[PDB]
Amino acid sequence: PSMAPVLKNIMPAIVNVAVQGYLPRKFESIGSGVIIDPNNGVIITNDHVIRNASLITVTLQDGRRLKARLIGGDSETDLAVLKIDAKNLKSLVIGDSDKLEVGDFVVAIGNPFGLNSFGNSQSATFGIVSALKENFIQTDAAINPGNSGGALVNAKGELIGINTAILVGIGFAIPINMVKDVAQQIIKFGSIHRGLMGIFVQHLTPELAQAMGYPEDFQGALVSQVNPNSPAELAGLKAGDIITQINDTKITQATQVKTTISLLRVGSTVKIIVERDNKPLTLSAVVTDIKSHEQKLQSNNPFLYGLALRAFEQESPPHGNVIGVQVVGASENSAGWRAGIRPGDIIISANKKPVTDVKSLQTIAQEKKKELLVQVLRGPGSMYLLVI
Amino acid sequence: MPSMAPVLKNIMPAIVNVAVQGYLPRKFESIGSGVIIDPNNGVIITNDHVIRNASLITVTLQDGRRLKARLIGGDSETDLAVLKIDAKNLKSLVIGDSDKLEVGDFVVAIGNPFGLSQSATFGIVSALKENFIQTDAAINPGNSGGALVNAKGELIGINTAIVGIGFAIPINMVKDVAQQIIKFGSIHRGLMGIFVQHLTPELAQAMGYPEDFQGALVSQVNPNSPAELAGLKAGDIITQINDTKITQATQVKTTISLLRVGSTVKIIVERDNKPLTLSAVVTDIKSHEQKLQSNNPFLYGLALRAFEQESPPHGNVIGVQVVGASENSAGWRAGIRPGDIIISANKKPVTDVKSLQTIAQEKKKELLVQVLRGPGSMYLLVI
Amino acid sequence: AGDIITQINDTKITQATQVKTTISLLRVGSTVKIIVERDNKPLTLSAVVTDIKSHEQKLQSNNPFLYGLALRAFEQESPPHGNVIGVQVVGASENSAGWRAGIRPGDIIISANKKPVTDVKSLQTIAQEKKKELLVQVLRGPGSMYLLVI
């Protein structure tokens, strides 16, 4: 046998992508790309291939050199969608990257050379899927700058990933199922606007599965935290829940949650099915804007937002016995930080009243809407600060 | 279970270690591989770079003999060399056809890197095109000069060490190089005098041919060349050279490159959708340059244009500007350099190129030119 | 050329400087009033600011094959080509159809749609006649190449 017959029929889908530009100086960048919609002339490539482009020219196997338009990109997943206006365009069968196993055979194909290598401008390498799982297919089919943005295909010649050359036998591809959904969102909207759900997940290993009361082969995503006032908390999610489904996607691996949710639209209602102590629950959460949530959090805690605070009592020369609330941390976006509070500060009075524990400070902080006057001890000195 | 072990076991005996000692123009060693391609006459192929500068070439077979080899000949351009050993009970392998290769085919690269033992790697044909096969079967100094074989274990290439990017020289070319080295001792490249380019579909349609039409597009036929005499023209599509069908532009150079001077070459073309068979005689590159020189003995190699420019302190300068001048020209030798303005010739004013060309025909022995160079001037005799 | 802008819109001009800055940042779509002096007679003019890339796309659409190419007549004896007559590409913007098709500065265009090109006008004539594609034969150093401009 040979992989040559399958490669022959999909080669017209693989294009060369040439970029000219200026960086924050003059450069050129060559990679590959894959035609994923031949009727509308949509081509996927890597974001790193096209970043800072002034110009992008696509070359097909048949020799035509086409001016390409950027539909949009997404640096986080290193994908970009391009459009060319042409006819007589070919694609390939799109596969399901969720069905991929370690040990399956694959070919990585690019078209690094374009027109002066016409009829032999493509480049193919052979290996296996070496590992799965930010989330990438890993292969021993050498993947190199030439061929980054090109096609990883399975043995039946179906597209299962987009090659990405990062950085020595080992290469990486972005799995096609994620690619499909990033592309579709870029086409509709021009960029991915990621929102917030507010939960961390971890891999449910057979060992944790059994220690939590589930069979050793039970699958899903283990929820390790739900943040206060997040969409996930509102929906009723709790730590220790196992997520088994998000909307219509069956969840068998923690990586799929981040994937499936990351690209939902701010405003969307999402259905989440969990197991909690062996009992199934259906929950519903609304994805929110990350910046709108952070504004909410500030609004409801306008003075103490972003401060890590603990009770404190300590003989502290030359101040005598110091009783107060120690600021262990302060985010630089806080009203506290802006007023001048810094980690290590001890809050010893607030609106002219003594502070003993964190709760006493929180109660005082609810006194005025306009400002909070804090007296802070900082090493051997002190100062009054107005947090507004 | 499926395995490449059976085919390989039958071809290992054709693969040899090649060890070289000599002195770099001081002492050095070079170890590579090579392949027996004629078992009866002990003919072995390796790379020219393995055996270069050798005082001694030793060949180690799988059965364990270490033999003294002699160099029949080399060609650095294709990086091949042909060795001879005087020994019996030699084994070879079926030699395949590199033209039948496609991207995706399975290949094994095999060598014998150790010497005073064998080594195989696996991959596919990555790219085809100096028309090297590219593969991801790792090639490395040790296995350079060794065999690249297809899945049936036929020799399709000779490996050459330039990651997951190795290279081999296609066997069809090796065949040609080897027979020419065995017969004459080296390769004496001749001249045809054309440039060729890819015939893509759009260019096919643009020129009045089906979109899938195949050949090599002639983009230039040099004046006074053998291709010119034969009657080739720009815009012709070469579809066959001798017995080789031409489907890609790269095939023209490889097929003609290795044909010998004085050889008669049959070039079949299509011109305005009619086939024509043209016949040309490959010429010796040096005696063609000689012929060009002899027919244009003073102006040969000079790029010239008409010149008119107010140019202080010379006033209004009218003449012929030397835009370029090959260093092998009689002009260059006489002292003409690029940027010179020829303002007279055999004591007559020069206005345009044709007026210089006419003056130049006045005598066979010498051409007297006055050249203006920056602010100065000089008389030169071109002979 | 040779006009002296005395006033732009609301602002009065006494400095070349004021002209750039005042229009430098003026907004696309904006209409703008410009007062000038020609040989002592003052005219009052109206112009509409346009978007840099739409303008460039206009130029390209109006001159599909030769947009962006600096061109001059060329005649020269050039080994090994013999006597070369044609149109030399003195410059080629990288965003042109010509650059995309492979034309580079220094190329000599010696025919277009199978016809001979002698001067700039003859090339511009051939390009106007034909539509959709332009087939150009160019000399490049010792070599040559067919190029298809689309």
Side-chain angles (χ1 to χ4, degrees):
Chain A
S2 174
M3 281 280 313
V6 3
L7 300 195
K8 199 196 301 172
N9 285 155
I10 68 158
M11 279 182 211
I14 311 308
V15 305
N16 177 90
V17 174
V19 180
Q20 281 57 53
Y22 295 68
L23 46 88
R25 183 124 319 282
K26 180 61 181 287
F27 80 92
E28 59 225 52
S29 156
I30 301 279
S32 302
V34 188
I35 290 157
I36 63 164
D37 183 345
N39 304 304
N40 298 121
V42 170
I43 288 179
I44 294 306
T45 190
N46 295 309
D47 199 57
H48 80 255
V49 168
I50 61 65
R51 264 199 302 271
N52 302 304
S54 303
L55 221 138
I56 317 169
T57 310
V58 163
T59 309
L60 307 185
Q61 177 210 249
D62 73 27
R64 300 180 265 163
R65 300 252 288 154
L66 300 159
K67 186 167 149 39
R69 186 158 71 65
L70 205 226
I71 298 197
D74 189 53
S75 52
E76 204 198 324
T77 53
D78 197 17
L79 297 167
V81 184
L82 303 181
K83 162 127 185 193
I84 53 169
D85 309 322
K87 338 84 141 46
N88 207 135
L89 251 42
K90 266 130 204 94
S91 201
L92 29 22
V93 175
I94 297 123
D96 179 359
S97 53
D98 288 329
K99 257 60 155 61
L100 285 184
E101 299 177 274
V102 169
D104 287 331
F105 299 115
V106 298
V107 170
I109 320 174
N111 177 344
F113 302 119
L115 205 292
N116 81 297
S117 284
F118 165 91
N120 307 112
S121 51
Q122 317 213 160
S123 188
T125 58
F126 183 81
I128 62 161
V129 174
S130 291
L132 300 164
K133 156 102 261 116
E134 42 284 333
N135 140 39
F136 288 117
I137 303 164
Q138 164 178 327
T139 184
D140 63 347
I143 291 286
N144 52 47
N147 297 254
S148 195
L152 214 220
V153 301
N154 63 24
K156 312 147 92 62
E158 310 182 328
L159 188 59
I160 58 154
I162 297 299
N163 313 137
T164 311
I166 132 80
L167 158 154
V168 214
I170 312 162
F172 293 94
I174 303 150
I176 191 61
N177 283 5
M178 190 182 107
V179 173
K180 289 191 330 184
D181 303 36
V182 163
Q184 182 255 301
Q185 166 149 320
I186 282 162
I187 289 168
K188 218 221 213 80
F189 299 108
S191 77
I192 306 313
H193 185 99
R194 286 171 175 83
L196 177 52
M197 177 73 61
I199 66 156
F200 281 58
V201 291
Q202 77 188 87
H203 185 72
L204 176 71
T205 64
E207 183 194 43
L208 256 352
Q210 299 197 275
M212 281 159 178
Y214 297 91
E216 68 176 21
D217 63 348
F218 195 67
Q219 299 180 287
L222 169 55
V223 174
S224 49
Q225 128 182 175
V226 182
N227 296 149
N229 305 297
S230 58
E233 186 179 79
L234 208 197
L237 202 74
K238 299 196 167 174
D241 293 356
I242 305 298
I243 290 159
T244 59
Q245 211 176 116
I246 292 178
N247 292 334
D248 298 317
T249 308
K250 203 69 197 140
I251 271 105
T252 62
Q253 301 252 230
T255 42
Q256 309 169 301
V257 165
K258 335 192 81 157
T259 293
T260 305
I261 281 172
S262 83
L263 318 171
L264 284 15
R265 281 249 129 197
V266 166
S268 25
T269 284
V270 19
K271 164 173 153 190
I272 304 158
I273 292 182
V274 300
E275 285 281 322
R276 172 178 309 163
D277 305 332
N278 281 97
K279 289 173 219 70
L281 297 159
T282 297
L283 309 168
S284 193
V286 178
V287 178
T288 56
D289 189 76
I290 306 159
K291 296 160 76 142
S292 298
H293 175 78
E294 212 63 24
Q295 230 328 111
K296 176 172 81 138
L297 268 40
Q298 289 174 208
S299 291
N300 297 347
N301 190 7
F303 307 127
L304 300 187
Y305 168 84
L307 303 178
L309 298 174
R310 67 158 212 125
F312 184 82
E313 183 172 6
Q314 170 177 306
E315 204 53 61
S316 313
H319 307 284
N321 196 31
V322 175
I323 294 160
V325 167
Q326 176 173 63
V327 177
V328 172
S331 59
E332 307 180 38
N333 69 334
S334 61
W337 180 279
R338 270 204 302 294
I341 298 174
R342 293 289 177 277
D345 284 355
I346 312 310
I347 298 164
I348 63 162
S349 83
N351 296 339
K352 320 305 270 158
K353 290 166 212 74
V355 161
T356 48
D357 64 9
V358 169
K359 165 84 165 171
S360 53
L361 180 60
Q362 283 164 335
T363 297
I364 293 162
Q366 328 218 246
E367 289 173 4
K368 316 171 216 138
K369 278 281 209 279
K370 171 161 232 68
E371 61 202 15
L372 174 64
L373 177 74
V374 309
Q375 183 180 15
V376 291
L377 250 47
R378 169 164 324 161
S382 282
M383 55 188 343
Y384 285 97
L385 265 5
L386 259 177
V387 181
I388 54 181
Chain B
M1 64 199 182
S3 166
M4 281 281 81
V7 310
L8 295 186
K9 200 223 284 79
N10 291 132
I11 50 207
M12 288 339 201
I15 314 293
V16 302
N17 180 82
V18 163
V20 177
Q21 293 101 55
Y23 318 93
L24 290 179
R26 75 101 55 100
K27 223 160 196 335
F28 73 92
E29 294 187 54
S30 145
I31 288 28
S33 284
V35 182
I36 298 172
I37 61 163
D38 185 347
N40 305 319
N41 298 133
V43 171
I44 283 162
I45 288 143
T46 194
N47 285 317
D48 194 51
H49 84 257
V50 167
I51 58 80
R52 211 127 61 208
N53 303 303
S55 283
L56 224 173
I57 304 172
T58 307
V59 159
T60 308
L61 311 180
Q62 160 179 273
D63 68 29
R65 293 176 271 168
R66 306 236 307 151
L67 293 342
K68 182 182 219 321
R70 73 171 169 95
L71 206 221
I72 295 172
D75 180 69
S76 66
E77 266 217 77
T78 54
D79 201 20
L80 294 162
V82 175
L83 306 180
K84 191 147 185 327
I85 56 168
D86 287 346
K88 283 313 175 81
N89 249 275
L90 258 25
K91 286 195 164 46
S92 190
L93 40 25
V94 5
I95 124 139
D97 184 339
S98 40
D99 285 327
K100 148 185 222 181
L101 293 169
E102 328 193 79
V103 162
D105 285 340
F106 294 116
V107 293
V108 173
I110 313 165
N112 182 1
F114 312 111
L116 187 295
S117 211
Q118 303 220 357
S119 195
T121 56
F122 180 82
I124 60 173
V125 172
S126 293
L128 299 161
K129 345 226 155 215
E130 287 216 357
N131 65 322
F132 293 96
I133 295 158
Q134 181 185 310
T135 193
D136 61 351
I139 276 108
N140 50 33
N143 303 278
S144 202
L148 191 70
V149 306
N150 60 20
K152 294 146 88 190
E154 313 173 330
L155 188 72
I156 66 255
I158 294 291
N159 309 143
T160 301
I162 212 201
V163 157
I165 295 163
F167 291 108
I169 304 132
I171 195 59
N172 294 3
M173 210 177 64
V174 177
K175 272 184 269 202
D176 300 342
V177 165
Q179 69 89 188
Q180 185 165 164
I181 286 172
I182 290 160
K183 197 167 174 31
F184 303 98
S186 72
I187 273 108
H188 195 76
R189 272 167 189 89
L191 172 106
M192 188 59 42
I194 61 172
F195 288 77
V196 113
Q197 81 186 88
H198 287 280
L199 188 65
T200 66
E202 51 175 23
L203 237 7
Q205 288 163 333
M207 292 164 67
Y209 293 87
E211 141 181 275
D212 67 320
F213 197 79
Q214 274 165 350
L217 175 54
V218 181
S219 42
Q220 157 173 325
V221 173
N222 298 161
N224 311 303
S225 66
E228 188 185 67
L229 220 201
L232 245 207
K233 285 165 156 212
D236 291 353
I237 297 168
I238 291 171
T239 59
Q240 188 130 188
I241 294 192
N242 292 344
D243 288 314
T244 309
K245 175 151 177 62
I246 263 86
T247 68
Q248 339 208 11
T250 312
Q251 302 185 74
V252 167
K253 184 176 155 153
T254 93
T255 308
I256 273 154
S257 214
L258 303 170
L259 295 171
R260 258 188 125 62
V261 325
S263 156
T264 295
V265 50
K266 294 304 179 172
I267 296 175
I268 298 180
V269 298
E270 210 142 308
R271 170 178 311 157
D272 308 323
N273 312 93
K274 307 269 174 81
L276 304 164
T277 308
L278 303 177
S279 196
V281 186
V282 178
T283 188
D284 175 282
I285 289 150
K286 261 147 73 289
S287 54
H288 173 78
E289 220 56 60
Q290 272 273 240
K291 174 167 76 70
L292 265 22
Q293 282 163 338
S294 284
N295 299 158
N296 185 12
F298 307 127
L299 307 182
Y300 162 85
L302 303 180
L304 299 180
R305 61 168 190 75
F307 182 94
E308 181 157 358
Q309 172 182 306
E310 182 62 37
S311 316
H314 303 284
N316 192 26
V317 173
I318 297 171
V320 165
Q321 183 177 53
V322 176
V323 175
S326 63
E327 306 187 35
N328 69 336
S329 64
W332 180 278
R333 163 145 41 72
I336 291 170
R337 302 290 176 272
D340 292 346
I341 318 291
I342 303 174
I343 53 163
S344 71
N346 293 335
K347 252 76 207 289
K348 295 161 259 267
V350 156
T351 56
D352 49 27
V353 171
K354 176 80 260 156
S355 77
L356 182 49
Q357 281 167 331
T358 303
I359 290 156
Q361 288 188 318
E362 293 169 6
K363 51 243 206 263
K364 297 311 168 101
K365 192 49 139 17
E366 80 220 349
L367 168 69
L368 180 75
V369 75
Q370 181 183 15
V371 297
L372 187 148
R373 174 182 289 138
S377 263
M378 201 169 32
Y379 280 100
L380 283 2
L381 238 224
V382 186
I383 56 176
Chain C
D3 295 7
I4 293 127
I5 298 171
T6 54
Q7 177 192 143
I8 286 179
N9 273 349
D10 289 350
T11 91
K12 307 102 176 108
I13 286 100
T14 56
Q15 296 287 315
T17 287
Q18 298 157 41
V19 169
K20 178 178 94 216
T21 59
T22 304
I23 296 154
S24 169
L25 86 239
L26 221 153
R27 189 139 189 123
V28 183
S30 161
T31 296
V32 40
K33 204 65 187 178
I34 300 184
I35 308 272
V36 101
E37 208 101 60
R38 296 232 170 126
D39 318 311
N40 317 109
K41 168 111 82 90
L43 290 151
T44 294
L45 294 172
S46 185
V48 179
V49 182
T50 62
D51 176 76
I52 276 98
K53 270 159 268 186
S54 339
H55 175 70
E56 224 53 37
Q57 284 224 225
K58 163 167 157 259
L59 267 21
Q60 298 176 316
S61 303
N62 283 349
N63 189 6
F65 310 129
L66 306 185
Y67 166 80
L69 297 184
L71 303 174
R72 61 173 202 85
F74 183 86
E75 185 169 11
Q76 167 179 317
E77 188 57 49
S78 345
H81 310 293
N83 189 36
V84 177
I85 291 152
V87 170
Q88 174 185 58
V89 177
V90 167
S93 62
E94 313 204 12
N95 76 346
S96 57
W99 181 279
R100 168 189 336 113
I103 278 155
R104 299 282 182 278
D107 288 349
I108 311 317
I109 297 167
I110 64 167
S111 74
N113 296 333
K114 259 23 157 105
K115 307 210 268 193
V117 162
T118 59
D119 58 10
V120 174
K121 191 84 229 132
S122 66
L123 174 56
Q124 286 166 331
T125 306
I126 286 171
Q128 277 148 30
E129 85 197 9
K130 190 106 166 22
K131 318 136 31 161
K132 262 309 207 204
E133 80 204 1
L134 189 65
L135 176 71
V136 293
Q137 186 181 19
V138 307
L139 263 24
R140 173 175 298 158
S144 270
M145 195 139 286
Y146 288 99
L147 272 21
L148 215 221
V149 192
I150 302 167

